[PDB]
Amino acid sequence: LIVTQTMKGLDIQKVAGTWYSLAMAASDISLLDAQSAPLRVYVEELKPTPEGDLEILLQKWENGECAQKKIIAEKTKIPAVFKIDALNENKVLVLDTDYKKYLLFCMENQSLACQCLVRTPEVDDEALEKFDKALKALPMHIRLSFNPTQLEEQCHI
Amino acid sequence: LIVTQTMKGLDIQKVAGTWYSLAMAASDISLLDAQSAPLRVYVEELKPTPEGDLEILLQKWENGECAQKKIIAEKTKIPAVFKIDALNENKVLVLDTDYKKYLLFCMENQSLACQCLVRTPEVDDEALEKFDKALKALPMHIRLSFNPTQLEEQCHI
Ligand SMILES: CCCCCCCCCCCCOS(=O)(=O)O
Ligand SMILES: CCCCCCCCCCCCOS(=O)(=O)O
């Protein structure tokens, strides 16, 4: 592991709905620098299933255009940790959430990216503070932040 | 203005010599995101002149390659503020320095980029702390950081 913050008592059902990728950070600049960078992903919505897996809808710049993406995170024995089936299986960790305003999560394979998710297209200073505090314990080298205008655009244009 | 930290008592002669661009931050992502981004510049050396102007040597990715650059910052009535002659004249502000370990500066036209400069190819946590504290009073949206290996490479490859 690298991340050692996970949320206790996570009720996955309650993260359902609309999210905005307010800020992102990664351990390597190449993970986030270009518009087409591997982990430069913009969360649209989370749909927990009844079995407790997590369907994710997001946007990614790929074809020289903003593409829709539907991916599936499978549950593990840890309620705050999920697993996506890629070539090498990537781990998703929910560090913290209050369900109604913000959610903080990291993705790790080694390399790592984290995001601050918010419910509304607004700069939540407080959620950004939690994000930054969760991150000082991590070796990040690129950090991005978006404004309310960009949050309402496809791929944060 | 946007930046309202400048260093008091700056002795420009004493910033002469070798510097490393340890961290950079900008108000807009486009200023720093790509390798060829406008303000993605890597400081090599500062040469104050006897009149008190400041010659800057730096590296910039431009031709699909890492290019050498020699630019001149002209003094103003404020010891911590200098002016580069571009199409629109850009202002350079020295926020803080201890001459021997770190220097913090911002460039502003509106948009803005700041850097944490260090003498040695080492992660100075303390200088990075000062940088981050000087920045919370600013509206930055992209932040980059480099490791010791990259600091010894041309254009931080
Ligand atoms: C509880 C938080 C939910 C996790 C948020 C989404 C993680 C997305 C991982 C994308 C990997 C790369 O995606 S790709 O389809 O473009 O290859
Ligand atoms: C005391 C600190 C000294 C200031 C550091 C250098 C500022 C460089 C501004 C580059 C502008 C863009 O440069 S360009 O030549 O590529 O167009």
Swiss-Prot record, chains A, B:
Effect of mutating Q59H: In variant C; found only in the Jersey breed
UniProt PTM: Alternate disulfide bonds occur in equal amounts in all variants examined.
Protein name: Beta-lactoglobulin
UniProt KW keywords: Allergen, Disulfide bond, Milk protein, Retinol-binding, Secreted, Signal, Transport
A Pfam family the protein falls into: Lipocalin
Compartment annotation: Secreted
A cellular component term, taken from the record's GO annotations: extracellular region
Tissue specificity as recorded in UniProt: Synthesized in mammary gland and secreted in milk.
UniProt entry tagged with the keyword Magnesium: no
Domain of life (superkingdom): Eukaryota
Family of the protein in this entry: Belongs to the calycin superfamily. Lipocalin family.
GO molecular-function term, one example from the UniProt record: long-chain fatty acid binding
Species per Swiss-Prot/TrEMBL record: Bos taurus
Assembly: Under physiological conditions beta-lactoglobulin exists as an equilibrium mixture of monomeric and dimeric forms. Interaction with LMBR1L which mediates the endocytosis of LGB has been observed in PubMed:17991420, but not in PubMed:23964685.
Disulfide bonds: C66-C155, C106-C114, C106-C116
